[PDB]
Design an enzyme around this catalytic site. Structure first.
Site, PDB file in Angstrom:
ATOM      1  N   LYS A 244       1.834  -3.676   6.628  1.00  0.00           N
ATOM      2  CA  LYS A 244       2.351  -3.247   4.997  1.00  0.00           C
ATOM      3  C   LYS A 244       3.628  -2.819   4.897  1.00  0.00           C
ATOM      4  O   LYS A 244       4.261  -3.484   4.031  1.00  0.00           O
ATOM      5  CB  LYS A 244       1.035  -2.486   4.287  1.00  0.00           C
TER       6      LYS A 244
ATOM      7  N   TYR B 175      -2.302  -1.671  10.249  1.00  0.00           N
ATOM      8  CA  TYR B 175      -2.285  -2.049   8.538  1.00  0.00           C
ATOM      9  C   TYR B 175      -0.874  -1.140   8.296  1.00  0.00           C
ATOM     10  O   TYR B 175      -0.099  -2.008   7.540  1.00  0.00           O
ATOM     11  CB  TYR B 175      -3.443  -0.967   7.877  1.00  0.00           C
TER      12      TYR B 175
ATOM     13  N   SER C  93       0.892  -1.122  -0.011  1.00  0.00           N
ATOM     14  CA  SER C  93      -0.138   0.036  -0.162  1.00  0.00           C
ATOM     15  C   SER C  93       0.635   1.217  -0.135  1.00  0.00           C
ATOM     16  O   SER C  93       1.963   1.156   0.517  1.00  0.00           O
ATOM     17  CB  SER C  93      -0.819   0.151   1.276  1.00  0.00           C
TER      18      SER C  93
HETATM   19  N1  LIG Z   1      -8.492  -0.210  -1.980  1.00  0.00           N
HETATM   20  C1  LIG Z   1      -7.418   0.587  -1.810  1.00  0.00           C
HETATM   21  O1  LIG Z   1      -7.797   1.941  -1.877  1.00  0.00           O
HETATM   22  C2  LIG Z   1      -5.983  -0.081  -1.615  1.00  0.00           C
HETATM   23  C3  LIG Z   1      -6.141  -1.251  -1.382  1.00  0.00           C
HETATM   24  N2  LIG Z   1      -4.629  -1.732  -1.054  1.00  0.00           N
HETATM   25  C4  LIG Z   1      -4.396  -3.386  -1.096  1.00  0.00           C
HETATM   26  O2  LIG Z   1      -5.064  -3.983  -2.130  1.00  0.00           O
HETATM   27  C5  LIG Z   1      -5.540  -5.315  -1.719  1.00  0.00           C
HETATM   28  C6  LIG Z   1      -6.968  -5.761  -1.959  1.00  0.00           C
HETATM   29  O3  LIG Z   1      -7.797  -4.756  -1.521  1.00  0.00           O
HETATM   30  P1  LIG Z   1      -9.306  -4.313  -1.950  1.00  0.00           P
HETATM   31  O4  LIG Z   1      -9.396  -5.017  -3.249  1.00  0.00           O
HETATM   32  O5  LIG Z   1      -9.236  -2.773  -1.602  1.00  0.00           O
HETATM   33  O6  LIG Z   1     -10.286  -5.272  -0.809  1.00  0.00           O
HETATM   34  P2  LIG Z   1     -11.587  -6.028  -0.903  1.00  0.00           P
HETATM   35  O7  LIG Z   1     -11.916  -6.188   0.456  1.00  0.00           O
HETATM   36  O8  LIG Z   1     -12.332  -5.329  -2.040  1.00  0.00           O
HETATM   37  O9  LIG Z   1     -11.097  -7.503  -1.675  1.00  0.00           O
HETATM   38  C7  LIG Z   1     -10.265  -8.378  -0.608  1.00  0.00           C
HETATM   39  C8  LIG Z   1     -10.174  -9.737  -1.376  1.00  0.00           C
HETATM   40  O10 LIG Z   1      -9.673 -10.416  -0.620  1.00  0.00           O
HETATM   41  C9  LIG Z   1     -10.348 -11.619  -0.086  1.00  0.00           C
HETATM   42  N3  LIG Z   1      -9.783 -11.955   1.141  1.00  0.00           N
HETATM   43  C10 LIG Z   1      -9.935 -11.124   2.331  1.00  0.00           C
HETATM   44  N4  LIG Z   1      -9.349 -11.944   3.433  1.00  0.00           N
HETATM   45  C11 LIG Z   1      -8.863 -12.899   2.821  1.00  0.00           C
HETATM   46  C12 LIG Z   1      -8.349 -14.114   3.487  1.00  0.00           C
HETATM   47  N5  LIG Z   1      -7.995 -14.197   4.629  1.00  0.00           N
HETATM   48  N6  LIG Z   1      -8.252 -15.279   2.617  1.00  0.00           N
HETATM   49  C13 LIG Z   1      -8.367 -15.268   1.269  1.00  0.00           C
HETATM   50  N7  LIG Z   1      -9.141 -14.389   0.719  1.00  0.00           N
HETATM   51  C14 LIG Z   1      -8.949 -13.200   1.508  1.00  0.00           C
HETATM   52  C15 LIG Z   1     -11.726 -11.208  -0.067  1.00  0.00           C
HETATM   53  O11 LIG Z   1     -12.607 -12.039  -0.318  1.00  0.00           O
HETATM   54  P3  LIG Z   1     -13.144 -12.675   1.039  1.00  0.00           P
HETATM   55  O12 LIG Z   1     -13.684 -11.778   1.910  1.00  0.00           O
HETATM   56  O13 LIG Z   1     -14.223 -13.933   0.574  1.00  0.00           O
HETATM   57  O14 LIG Z   1     -11.937 -13.899   1.704  1.00  0.00           O
HETATM   58  C16 LIG Z   1     -11.681 -10.425  -1.412  1.00  0.00           C
HETATM   59  O15 LIG Z   1     -11.795 -11.167  -2.584  1.00  0.00           O
HETATM   60  C17 LIG Z   1      -5.289  -5.469  -0.190  1.00  0.00           C
HETATM   61  O16 LIG Z   1      -4.174  -6.091   0.019  1.00  0.00           O
HETATM   62  C18 LIG Z   1      -5.309  -4.070   0.226  1.00  0.00           C
HETATM   63  O17 LIG Z   1      -4.691  -3.875   1.489  1.00  0.00           O
HETATM   64  C19 LIG Z   1      -3.623  -1.320  -1.225  1.00  0.00           C
HETATM   65  C20 LIG Z   1      -3.585   0.501  -1.446  1.00  0.00           C
HETATM   66  C21 LIG Z   1      -5.134   0.699  -1.327  1.00  0.00           C
END
Ligand SMILES: NC(=O)C1=CN([C@@H]2O[C@H](COP(=O)(O)OP(=O)(O)OC[C@H]3O[C@@H](n4cnc5c(N)ncnc54)[C@H](OP(=O)(O)O)[C@@H]3O)[C@@H](O)[C@H]2O)C=CC1
Ligand SMILES: NC(=O)C1=CN([C@@H]2O[C@H](COP(=O)(O)OP(=O)(O)OC[C@H]3O[C@@H](n4cnc5c(N)ncnc54)[C@H](OP(=O)(O)O)[C@@H]3O)[C@@H](O)[C@H]2O)C=CC1
Ligand SMILES: NC(=O)C1=CN([C@@H]2O[C@H](COP(=O)(O)OP(=O)(O)OC[C@H]3O[C@@H](n4cnc5c(N)ncnc54)[C@H](OP(=O)(O)O)[C@@H]3O)[C@@H](O)[C@H]2O)C=CC1
Ligand SMILES: NC(=O)C1=CN([C@@H]2O[C@H](COP(=O)(O)OP(=O)(O)OC[C@H]3O[C@@H](n4cnc5c(N)ncnc54)[C@H](OP(=O)(O)O)[C@@H]3O)[C@@H](O)[C@H]2O)C=CC1
Lengths: 263, 263, 263, 263
Positions: free
Chosen positions: D161, D157, D144
């Site tokens: 990260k 976080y 991030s």
């Molecule tokens: N959105 C943003 O502004 C930013 C996001 N990021 C990073 O991008 C990445 C994606 O985030 P984002 O798309 O925003 O998040 P979402 O919450 O939209 O998506 C998360 C995805 O990961 C899955 N997931 C969460 N926990 C687990 C787990 N323990 N095991 C397997 N799957 C898991 C969720 O499905 P399910 O719940 O069914 O497991 C979902 O498919 C993260 O690492 C986040 O920290 C980085 C910078 C900025």
């Protein structure tokens, strides 16, 4: 230069030898009372004795494992009973690693996480309220040049020290409203007992010239071409926790002889 | 804590007022002899008189423009003839900017390059030999937080300060063989005359609440929510140039009240 | 993946050979029209012919010194004349240095300032207006890994490239309101003519194993243990200037085979 | 530009929605077969169906918790069984935090360590050998912008990260000998459903204008003054894992609309 810490109470983790003891001597030299923390009881008793005799300050010993919540709670309870609270906290307990990512056990990761990061988290939770009540204070995290410039042989150390350097930054912003200043120091090559033990182990089959082994380490890594003494490092810790460094907040200060290769 | 610089020769550029003057006062307190360098001779006299009268040290004044090779030559020759050579050099002369890249004249870019970078290049060339001959020394470059975290209104300042920070690190590796330790300090908000001038000018038509204006600047940029005093900052310069910071080489040390937003 | 740059106008400075020519070929391939800029007329004419002949795009040649205001003006006016304005600008003209700070002439510092920093300043000033009028654009500064991690032997290059990297960032925040995205690329070891030339020079008296010499450089500096080809690097310049990198603003992107030692 | 990944097998963690799903579509578009990994079986099953229909690649679903060693073993096993090994691994599973250090429970620090760091450690240990055996590959860690520029409200976080970004670097140096290229991507504001959920929750009592809330966030933090789309971000993931990015090793690439405040 007056440091203005005479009679303040300084808790130093990992302070029965090496950097942590030199830090404790440096604060004691400035009139600060000392809380010493480490695992081995005997080395801890020596250190306290010598500090008291040399410097005439109060010294409390806490013989615990700071990598455990129990160990931290004992530090906190001992400080509270003897002193009320802390004015200064130096997180210094920690140790090198040696592994590949492909081969290291999960438990090894866990252990350096508890030692390098969770100790600082739990000591902040347990001591900040007392420091706040005393009007503020200073907290230092001894991370390492490895926190930004990783050494190839110790990935777990690099990662956990990186996490610790971020932690220091996030704590600084959270507690500055309490008049508590938090900073990180990242040392380069500091000549401590494990470096000597390592230099001997690595030279045992090619001549035993452990001093030449250490000289080649410094030649390859530091423009200064030598290790630091623990005492020269401690000076920076004392300065940063003094009344002379009152605008240092959330910074990382490298003390590394030119070893950092980037700006 | 003993600094060990009593009787050393400290050259401070931009020392007739603000930060440079506070640094000269910090060194004078520790018994260092002072070479003050600024353009305006009135204020240089007043500072020099006040230092001799308060601290009892020798002060040589050199009224010149350090952005010119002739000005630097004059400083080098004054130091050589009065003292033999310098033990400490603090590059502090500099000034903020205010422009857009789209509108600024080439000649303004050139002005800040001479002042912030070439002054330090030329002083190092001129003073390092005498410093070498004295057994070593310390050189500090006062760049700014803006050298890494640029302020939107002053791109020229930001670029030339970044260049200065890199210069410091490159000079560090070149001269450490001479026992000359070079570092950079990056201050955040420091309450100097120009800040108070600006605050008063910006509030002349809306209430003249210049203190309120400065407070909102602090609240916007610094977790500590105040400016530093020049004296708080001066301490760091004194420490870094002292016999207690002998392992600091090629580092950049922030003194910024939390203002730096990254690790 | 569609780059979405067919029919766009890309100005590439220093594009008669090496990285610049590779970048021009990468743009040409994607159907961009090319403004080539370099001092030697015939090398430039030959590069233009071969682009026109391989890729079938329009190529305009501007044979000038971009380190001079008059040269930049000539580029701006040829762009305006032939194409109306540019969509893409790649500041690539630059060259290594080789000196100590103690020995280098002020004039040498000046030359690298003009070539690495002022060219990009003057080209932004000259080209941003037409780019704005076309609805936005992309600007890249090819600085160097040396902009953050300085190489011992080339302090002028290190300082002036660090300055360029800061310029890139400050330009970024100024022109994003025009939908122009500015970013910096920092290459590690890229196999160009001067590298091979230098390897042959440095091995003329010890066996002429110039390949051996380059391999040892790669072994010393880069975990991937080879130089990049200019074409490998070019891909990144093309991608960052494409309709696929629309969220990249004010960033510095390293393309260095592991050479950067810090985070 | 040909990405050269048609027929390669890419594992994307957390790919049932948000950024991870956009990345999976981006690889799909390029003809890569896909391993989808997430906890919720229903969302995963439909994301998988929709990818196959839309892109005509193979899609393997693995419905597990990648924060647990068991979950990671199931991924490795199913990839081994269905494909032999992976060519591409994107560590994306992760989530924001929200707490003070003074109040957060140790359990919560532990949960974020397992999810953001240990998932990547364990998936590197489990998948690298198969990737090695296939002739190499690419591994990305989505950390991030918070890894270097911490947000005040999510210390856990920011710390975990940061650790993940260092882990990415330490892995890159370890596996480059296997022709595996590891890099980190640091996104800024990316419009995902939790941002929308948050914008609604926080506007519930002041008018419900969740879009204007998001706009105020973008205005405060990003010079480009908008959030990215997940598809926008995904382009950089596919590029970095492509045959066009073969000299990217152990780098951290920010995709942040100008959000990073430093160089
Ligand atoms: N959105 C943003 O502004 C930013 C996001 N990021 C990073 O991008 C990445 C994606 O985030 P984002 O798309 O925003 O998040 P979402 O919450 O939209 O998506 C998360 C995805 O990961 C899955 N997931 C969460 N926990 C687990 C787990 N323990 N095991 C397997 N799957 C898991 C969720 O499905 P399910 O719940 O069914 O497991 C979902 O498919 C993260 O690492 C986040 O920290 C980085 C910078 C900025
Ligand atoms: N030496 C160097 O080159 C560098 C060191 N550092 C950092 O400096 C710090 C101190 O290192 P250094 O002085 O070299 O190390 P030493 O091994 O010399 O000292 C470690 C000290 O910490 C104590 N300690 C270790 N683990 C624990 C624990 N779990 N609970 C309580 N005390 C503990 C030790 O006593 P006991 O065993 O009795 O518990 C001892 O007093 C470390 O954080 C290290 O990472 C940073 C950069 C460089
Ligand atoms: N104040 C702040 O918030 C911060 C300041 N800094 C840096 O601190 C340094 C000192 O600034 P500060 O105290 O704020 O400013 P002041 O204007 O208060 O001090 C500037 C000093 O430099 C001298 N000076 C300026 N140009 C020249 C020149 N060409 N030759 C010789 N002397 C010169 C001035 O005197 P005269 O005009 O008589 O020559 C004066 O003594 C600068 O480098 C500045 O960039 C960095 C971060 C923050
Ligand atoms: N090669 C490497 O390992 C690395 C290179 N870089 C950077 O890549 C860029 C290009 O370097 P590289 O391809 O290696 O070098 P080359 O010398 O091979 O190419 C440089 C190009 O710049 C042109 N040029 C040089 N000076 C001027 C000038 N004053 N006005 C107009 N054109 C000029 C040259 O043509 P002419 O002489 O005919 O004017 C030539 O076409 C430079 O900025 C360099 O600093 C960054 C990191 C690593």
């Amino acid at each position: 230069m007056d440091m203005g810490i005479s009679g303040k109470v300084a808790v130093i983790t990992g302070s029965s030898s090496g950097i942590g003891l030199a830090i404790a001597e440096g604060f004691a030299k400035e009139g600060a009372h000392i809380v010493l923390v480490a695992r081995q009881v005997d080395r801890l008793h020596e250190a306290a004795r010598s500090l008291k005799e040399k410097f005439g300050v109060r010294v409390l010993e806490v013989a615990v494992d700071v990598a455990t919540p129990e160990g931290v709670d004992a530090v906190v309870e001992s400080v509270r009973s003897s002193f009320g609270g802390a004015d200064i906290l130096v997180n210094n307990a920690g140790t090198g690693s040696n592994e590949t990512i492909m081969e290291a056990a999960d438990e090894k990761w866990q252990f350096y996480w508890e030692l390098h990061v969770m100790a600082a988290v739990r000591l902040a939770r347990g001591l900040v309220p007392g420091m706040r009540a005393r009007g503020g204070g200073a907290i230092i995290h001894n991370a390492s040049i490895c926190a930004v410039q990783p050494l190839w042989y110790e990935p777990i150390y690099n990662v956990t020290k990186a996490a610790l350097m971020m932690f220091s930054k996030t704590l600084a912003t959270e507690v500055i409203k309490d008049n508590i200043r938090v900073n990180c120091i990242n040392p380069g090559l500091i000549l401590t007992p494990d470096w000597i033990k390592t230099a001997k182990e690595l030279t045992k089959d090619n001549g035993g010239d452990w001093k030449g082994y250490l000289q080649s380490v410094a030649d390859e890594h530091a423009p200064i071409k030598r290790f630091a003494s623990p005492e020269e490092l401690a000076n920076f810790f004392v300065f940063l926790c003094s009344e002379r460094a009152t605008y240092s907040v959330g910074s990382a200060y490298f003390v590394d002889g030119g070893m950092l290769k980037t700006l």
